[PDB]
Design a protein around this ligand. Structure first.
Ligand SMILES: [Hg+2]
Ligand SMILES: [Hg+2]
Ligand SMILES: [Hg+2]
Ligand SMILES: [Hg+2]
Length: 439
C-alpha cells in the first residue's frame, strides 16, 4: 500500500453520508503484532468521514461490545439531542445519528464514545475516527496544490494481545502507552511528493501530549480544533493536548530525512515512591522524546507561497455573563472536581441563553495539565495564563497548565442539555465534568 498509512475515507455522495458502523472487538495486525482492539468499521483508527457544509449525515451505530456505548461528534456544533452525551446504546442494539453539517464550518473533527465512567477504557482500546469538513477555502491554490495527510496521534499499550487494563495509577494520571503511533502505525515513513504538505493533526490519546516539532522546520498553523485561523501563524513547535486538533502547512526546505518528534513535555503526571518515610506521590517529570514519523523531502523542493489569508473570524456580540469554573484534584483518591463537585447527570450546573455570548474563566488549581472541553458550543480562546492568544479561531478544547486561567468567549448555539469536562478522559470518568443547559 502507500508508504504512509492513513485511515480509509468515506465521502458523502450527492450530499448524503449514509453509513452503518459496528463497534466490535476486532483481531488485527498493529505495530507488527496481532492484537484484538475495539474498533469502528473493523479498523484502527476508524474510517475518516469526509463531508461538506450542508451535507446530511446518517450514521447507524451498531453496538457489538459487551457494555453500552454511544457516539460523541466531537467538535461539531450540532444539537445535543443528536450529539447526546447521556444516550446509552445497550449491547446488541443500534442507534441512528442524523444531522446536517452546519453551513459555516470547516476543519478536522472526530468521533468516539462518551458514556460517563466508560470513556477511558473504550477510547484506549481503539474506538475513535476522524471527521473532516471540506471547505471552499480548500480550493485556493496554496492549499489545493499542497499534499494533504491526516495524522491521528494515538498511543497504546498491549498485554496478552489486548489493550492493557487500567491500573489505579492510570485513573489518577490518565493512561499513556509505550506504542506511540500515527494512524495505528509505528513510526511510518512519509515520502513527500510535493514541497508543501498540508497536515491535519488529531490527538486521540487518553492522556498523552504531543509537543510537536519537525527537525529543521517551523510549522505554519492554519486551523485550530474547529476552524481556520485568519492567516497562517509560524510556530517552532506545537503542543497538542488530548482532544485537540490542528492543521499545519509544512514547507520542505531541502532534500533529506526529517524526524517529526513529540518532544519532552511534563504534564504533571505522578508516580509513587517510598524513601524511608513517605509513601507519597512524586512527579514523573517530562515524557521521553518520541519519533512520530520519518519525513522524506522530494528532490529540489520549492514550496508554494503561503496563503496570505484564510478565514476572517467573526467578531462576536458583546457577552452577557461571565462564568468561573475552578478545576481541582484529589490525586490519591483519583477524584477530580469542577467548583468542588463531581459530575451528576441529574444536576444542571450552568444555565445559559441560546444566541448570547458568555465569558468563561476556567482556572486550573491542580498540579496537572488539564485540557478543558465543552461540547456543542465552540469557543474563542482570548488568553491563557494571562497571555493573550496569538490568533483567532474556533476551539473546543483548551489546555491549562497548573495554576493557569483560560478566558474563553463562548457563543451559545444549540438548545438543550450538554456537558463540559476534562479531556484527560480518565479524569472525566472520575468526576471532572458538569452539565450546561441552554434554553
Ligand atoms: Hg472528545
Ligand atoms: Hg465528552
Ligand atoms: Hg518522596
Ligand atoms: Hg483532568
Amino acid at each position: 500500500g502507500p508508504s504512509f498509512p492513513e485511515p480509509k475515507v468515506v465521502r458523502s455522495q450527492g450530499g448524503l453520508l449514509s453509513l452503518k458502523l459496528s463497534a466490535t472487538p476486532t483481531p488485527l495486525a498493529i505495530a507488527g503484532q496481532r492484537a484484538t482492539l475495539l474498533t469502528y468499521g473493523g479498523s484502527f483508527p476508524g474510517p475518516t468521514l469526509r463531508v461538506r457544509p450542508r451535507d446530511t449525515v446518517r450514521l447507524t451505530l451498531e453496538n457489538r461490545l459487551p457494555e453500552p456505548t454511544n457516539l460523541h461528534w466531537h467538535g461539531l456544533p450540532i444539537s445535543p439531542k443528536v450529539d447526546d452525551p447521556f444516550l446509552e446504546i445497550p449491547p446488541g442494539e443500534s442507534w441512528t445519528y442524523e444531522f446536517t453539517v452546519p453551513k459555516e464550518l470547516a476543519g478536522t473533527f472526530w468521533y468516539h464514545p462518551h458514556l460517563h465512567g466508560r470513556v477511558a477504557p473504550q477510547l484506549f482500546a481503539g474506538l475513535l475516527g476522524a471527521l473532516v469538513v471540506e471547505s471552499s477555502l480548500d480550493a485556493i491554490p496554496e492549499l489545493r496544490e499542497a499534499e494533504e495527510h491526516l495524522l491521528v496521534l494515538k498511543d497504546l499499550a498491549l498485554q496478552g494481545g489486548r489493550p492493557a487494563p487500567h491500573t489505579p495509577m492510570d485513573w489518577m494520571n490518565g493512561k499513556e502507552g509505550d506504542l506511540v503511533l500515527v494512524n495505528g502505525a509505528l513510526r511510518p515513513t512519509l515520502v513527500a511528493q510535493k514541497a508543501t504538505l498540508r497536515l491535519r493533526l488529531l490527538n486521540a490519546s487518553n492522556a498523552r501530549y504531543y509537543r510537536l516539532a519537525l527537525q529543521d522546520h517551523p510549522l505554519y498553523l492554519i486551523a485550530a480544533d474547529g476552524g481556520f485561523l485568519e492567516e497562517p501563524l509560524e510556530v517552532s513547535e506545537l503542543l497538542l493536548a488530548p482532544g485537540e486538533r490542528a492543521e499545519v502547512l509544512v514547507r520542505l526546505r531541502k532534500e533529506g530525512r526529517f524526524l517529526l518528534q513529540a518532544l519532552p513535555y511534563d504534564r504533571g503526571a505522578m508516580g509513587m515512591m517510598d524513601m524511608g518515610g513517605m509513601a507519597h506521590a512524586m512527579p514523573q517529570g517530562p515524557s521521553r522524546p518520541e519519533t512520530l514519523l520519518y519525513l522524506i523531502a522530494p528532490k529540489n523542493p520549492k514550496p508554494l507561497p503561503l496563503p496570505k489569508a484564510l478565514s476572517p473570524f467573526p467578531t462576536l456580540p458583546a457577552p452577557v455573563v461571565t462564568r468561573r469554573l475552578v478545576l481541582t484534584e484529589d490525586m490519591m483518591a483519583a477524584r477530580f472536581f469542577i467548583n468542588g463537585q463531581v459530575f451528576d447527570h441529574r444536576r444542571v450546573d450552568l444555565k445559559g441563553q441560546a444566541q448570547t455570548v458568555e465569558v468563561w474563566e476556567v482556572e486550573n488549581q491542580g498540579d496537572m495539565d488539564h485540557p478543558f472541553h465543552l461540547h456543542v458550543h465552540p469557543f474563542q480562546v482570548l488568553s491563557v495564563g494571562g497571555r493573550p492568544f496569538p490568533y483567532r479561531a474556533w476551539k473546543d478544547v483548551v489546555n491549562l497548565k497548573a495554576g493557569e486561567v483560560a478566558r474563553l468567549l463562548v457563543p451559545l448555539r444549540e438548545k438543550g442539555r450538554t456537558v463540559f469536562h476534562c479531556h484527560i478522559v480518565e479524569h472525566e470518568d472520575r468526576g471532572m465534568m458538569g452539565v450546561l443547559e441552554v434554553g
